[PDB]
Structure formats: C-alpha cells, structure tokens
C-alpha cells in the first residue's frame, strides 16, 4: 500500500454544508485539502476513536470520530472503492471502515445518541442520519419539541436549514426529556422573537410569529410564511362587536399565495383578556434605538395592545382604528353579509372594512356612490349598496332599521354621495 493515498472526489460536511477536498491519508493522519476553503485539515491517528463507512449525498462516505469530541463526516467515496481505503485505514490508523449502516427503511421514529459532536438519530441501532451538533446556529424549545436551526451557511447547496424532533415524554423517568435533551444538544451546539399561539382568521389557523429583521415568519402547523414588512399597506385594530375580542388586520400587498388561493389581508383574532409575554433577542440599546423608548426588550400584557405596538414598529404603519362610529348596539361595526357569508362591516374613520372571509376593504375615496336600500329585517330595515370608481360593486345585506340612522348620520358626516340623497 502507499504510505499516503490521494483522491479528489471526496468531500467533508461542516456546519450545514458539504465541502469537497483533496483527501490525503497518511501514516500520521488524515490530511484533507478542502477546496471550498483551501484549508488543509489534518487529524492524527492519535486524535481519532472510530471510523465508519456508509452512504452520503455523493454516494458513500467515511465517518471519523476524534477523542476531542469533534466528529467529522466525509463523503464522495464510491462504495466500490472500499478495499483501497480500509486496507490503508487498518494499516496506519489501526482502525476499519465499520458498517454503521444508515437505516434505509425510511421511518421517522428512532433514537437520539450524543456521540460527541455527531448526534446520531437511529432506528434501533442503525442511524437514519446524524448531525454534527456544532452546526446548530440558533435553538429553541416547545412542548415535546426540539428545534435545531443550522448556521445560515449561504455557501451550501440545497441545505437542511431546520430539523425538529418530537420527543415523547418519558414513561420511566419524571425528568423532562426536552430540557435534558435540549441541554445535551446545547452541550455541543453553536447558538428575533416568537409571538407564540396567535389565532389567525386569515389564513385560518394558529401560528407562531418568528419576528425577523425585515419580515415576520408566521410559523404554522404545516405551512409557514414570511411577510416582508415592506408589503404591509396598512394595519387596523377593529374592536369586535362582542366587546370581548379584537380583530387585528394587516393589509398585504402582495397577498400571500396560500397554494392557489391568495390573501390581500392578514387577520388576527385575539381576546381582550388574552395576555402574553414577549422577549426580544436584541440588546436593550437596539430596542431603545429602534423603538424610541416606547417599548422594552421584555414586556407582558394584553396580546392585542402589545402586538399592535410591537408590529407598529417593525412595519412602522400606524394602528388604524374606527372613528366615533359605534352602532345603536354600540359595536364599532355592523352585522352584515357579503357574498355567501356573514361578517362585520366596520365604518372606519376614513374607509369601510368587511371583517373576516372574504375580507374586503373600502376607502371613501374609492366609493363612487352608495345607497341604503329598503332592507331585509323590517320594511324599514336596510341593505347597503356600494359601487367603486373602478366599476367594481360591493353590497352589504340585511341590517336592522336601528343601524340605518347611525350609518345615515355617518355617511353624511363622511359626506359621501348617496344615490337617494337627491330625493
């Protein structure tokens, strides 16, 4: 065998990225000239503990474990080259290319083993895959869930940026496996904020808002979306007629493309008593710097008031609120129907908005004319007609005689053109 063996098709995995290199096995150790960095990585036989031969992206790879706790993965070896590699391996490293087979059964259940830096996830004793823990750049915990976010190593290819593990609570031991597991990961890891459990009416579901510097990553139970703050046309705070909830609206332009369907709005529903606590993973100087002392790095209080303030900053849009419109029933909106559904029509101080699906907004400037037709509740009830300057017509049906006068007083106060005003 040669005293050293050289190859050019092998690679090495580091911090969420694979890296090719000119591997040079020697009597002294493995010397690898990484071509992405040009660096020569030399690991001596004395630093090593184990060698493994198994599948990777470019076919098969060589896994090397050091006494240092650092665990190195190598790729690009063809499974057919085994003899050339292992013969030299056994001769100088007194080690062999062991069969720690990847579990190709394709299951998601397994076992997590902290084999130093290389965390192994194994179906029984066959690792499905293993991650060098040093690759974790940010980390968070939730009930029965471990979040691993790798370094945003933009120099990588199709890169596994996030992996999450679901950890069933242990039956034999009362100690929390998430904290225990989370700290064990963190004992090798390399680690803005999340408004957790947000009740969205649009899109429908419960999402966790992972705030980011220029966008909010609305993390969901299957889908997720990032909304660049630049796209928000407006922010609205609409008090629910129940006097117990509030609808927070975010006009989106562009609309998020929910599969084929698209939303020109983001609608949130929160109760007036739905308190929460928020922590910014930012320095207080930065918090003061961006928020003029109107807020603090740590706060607690009603989610609606708090969220309205937090997002008002990230997007700068002012919180839009209804004018002095408060119906005969006192609500700042009117019971109505638009299309094949019912929702709330809000007489804003400078426009009209139909709350909940299909969500629609109107500005007094877009109105051509409107009218209070003889409605559907009583012979003196009303239905409200709207036609836009765009020729697009909207009409809100079925509204009590009681709300006729208030909207009658309101539109005259907004001085908009009513079809029957010439009567």
């Amino acid at each position: 065998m040669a005293e050293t063996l050289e190859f050019n098709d092998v690679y090495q995995e580091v911090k969420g990225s694979m890296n090719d290199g000119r591997l040079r096995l020697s009597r002294q150790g493995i010397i690898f000239k990484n071509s992405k960095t040009g660096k020569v990585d030399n690991i001596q036989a004395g630093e090593l503990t184990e060698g493994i031969w198994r599948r990777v992206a470019l076919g098969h790879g060589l896994k090397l474990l050091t006494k240092n706790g650092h665990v190195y993965k190598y790729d690009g070896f063809r499974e057919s080259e085994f003899e050339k590699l292992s013969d030299f391996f056994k001769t100088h490293y007194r080690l062999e290319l062991m069969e720690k087979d990847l579990c190709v059964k394709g299951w998601n259940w397994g076992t997590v083993k902290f084999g130093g830096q290389l965390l192994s996830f194994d179906i029984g004793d066959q690792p499905v895959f293993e991650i060098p823990l040093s690759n974790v750049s940010q980390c968070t915990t939730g009930k029965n869930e471990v979040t691993l976010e790798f370094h945003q190593n933009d120099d990588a290819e199709v890169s596994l940026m996030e992996v999450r593990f679901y950890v069933p609570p242990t039956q034999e031991d009362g100690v929390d496996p998430v904290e225990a597991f989370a700290q064990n990961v963190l004992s090798k890891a390399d680690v803005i904020c999340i408004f957790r459990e947000l009740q969205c009416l649009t899109p429908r579901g419960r999402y966790d808002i992972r705030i980011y510097p220029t966008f909010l990553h609305l993390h969901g139970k299957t889908f997720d979306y990032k909304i660049p703050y630049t796209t928000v046309l407006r922010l609205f705070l609409l008090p629910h007629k129940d006097q117990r909830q509030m609808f927070f609206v975010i006009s989106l332009d562009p609309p998020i493309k929910q599969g084929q369907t698209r939303y020109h709005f983001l609608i949130l529903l929160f109760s007036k008593d739905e308190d929460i606590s928020l922590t910014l993973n930012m320095n207080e100087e930065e918090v003061e710097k961006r928020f003029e002392g109107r807020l603090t790095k740590n706060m607690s209080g009603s989610l609606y008031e708090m969220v309205s303030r937090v997002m008002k900053a990230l997007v700068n849009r002012k919180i839009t609120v209804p004018g002095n419109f408060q119906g005969h029933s006192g609500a700042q909106c009117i019971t109505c129907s638009y299309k094949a559904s019912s929702g709330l029509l809000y007489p804003l101080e400078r426009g009209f908005i139909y709350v909940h699906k299909p969500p629609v907004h109107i500005r007094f400037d877009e109105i051509s004319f409107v009218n209070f037709a003889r409605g559907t509740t009583t012979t003196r009830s009303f239905d409200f007609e709207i036609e836009t300057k765009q020729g697009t017509q909207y009409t809100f049906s079925s509204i009590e005689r009681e709300e006729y006068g208030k909207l009658f007083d309101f539109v005259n106060a907004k001085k908009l053109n009513i079809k029957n005003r010439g009567l």
């Binding site: 690679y11 995995e13 969420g16 694979m18 198994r54 599948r55 990777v56 992206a57 470019l58 076919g59 790879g61 993965k73 790729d75 499974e79 087979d101 990847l102 190709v104 059964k105 394709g106 299951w107 998601n108 259940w109 397994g110 076992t111 997590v112 996830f121 499905v128 895959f129 293993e130 991650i131 060098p132 690759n135 029965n144 869930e145 790798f150 933009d154 290819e157 199709v158 890169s159 596994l160 940026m161 996030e162 992996v163 999450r164 593990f165 679901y166 950890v167 069933p168 242990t170 039956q171 220029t214 966008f215 990553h217 969901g220 299957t222 889908f223 997720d224 979306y225 990032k226 660049p228």
Partner: protein
C-alpha cells in the same frame, strides 16, 4: 358470539442500503423522490437519507427574500392529528423527526444545471404527486376490504 380482529405492516423504504437509489439529485445534494419505492431521498447534512412517503404528513414551501424554503412535515405523535391512531408508530416513545426544512436560493448559482430553488420546487411538486397517489392506493384498501364478490 364473538368479536373481530385486525393486522398492520411497517413502511419500509428499502430492504438494505444497497437497494436504495443512486439518482443524480442524490449526488447533486438535491431532494429527490423515488416513485418506484414511494420514497423521498434527501441530503441530510450531506447524508443521502430516504424517507418513505408514508411517513410524510404533508409539505409546505416559502420564499424568504433571497431563498426558497421547502418544509416537509412527517407523521409523529401530536402531528398525526385527527386519527384515532394516536401513536401510529410501532414505537411511539421513540423520538421522532417531526419535520425537515430545506432552503435553496431563488437565484441560479454559477455552474448549476438547475436553480437551487428549482430542485425544491420539483421535489415539492412531485412529493404531492407521489403522496396523493399513495394516499389514494391506501384509501382503496380501506374501502375495498369488507365486500363480497358479486
């Protein structure tokens, strides 16, 4: 008189590491789908790792400024919602890969045969295809069993 019995099988992608494919995407650090084996092959931190489509619950994708994020959600405790089969898994106390999220830039990088995001966009699309086909063949067996040959 007496009660009724049932049986179940495991979702094995490949019998051994040698039977698993060697398709170009795998080499190319690309998320791949092996339709013949109802299996998705993905580069898990440089490791070509298979996942039988039967483990994937559903998928999602997001464009995050300069990047395209493909998110793969898998069946696991608490995620396998609605089914009375809570803890579907042959070993529910095992830890589970809840989900996998890959990102690739929306912009074609130098020398590529396909945009980084193009692999995600095709894997995303093809997963829904193979998944629905599998769900459908599965649904057949549920509706098919319990019928007397006329």
């Amino acid at each position: 008189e007496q009660q009724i019995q049932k049986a179940r099988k495991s979702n094995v992608s490949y019998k051994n590491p040698s039977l698993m494919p060697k398709e170009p995407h795998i080499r190319e650090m690309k998320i791949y789908i092996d339709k013949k084996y109802e299996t998705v092959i993905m580069p898990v931190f440089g490791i070509a790792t298979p996942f039988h489509i039967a483990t994937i619950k559903n998928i999602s994708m997001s464009v995050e400024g300069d990047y395209t994020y493909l998110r793969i959600n898998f069946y696991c405790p608490g995620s396998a919602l609605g089914r009375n089969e809570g803890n579907i898994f042959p070993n529910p106390e095992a830890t589970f890969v809840k989900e996998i999220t890959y990102r690739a830039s929306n912009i074609k990088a130098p020398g590529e045969q396909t945009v980084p995001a193009l692999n995600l966009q095709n894997a995303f699309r093809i997963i829904k295809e193979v998944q629905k086909r599998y769900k459908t063949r599965e649904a057949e067996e549920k509706e098919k069993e319990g019928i007397v040959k006329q």
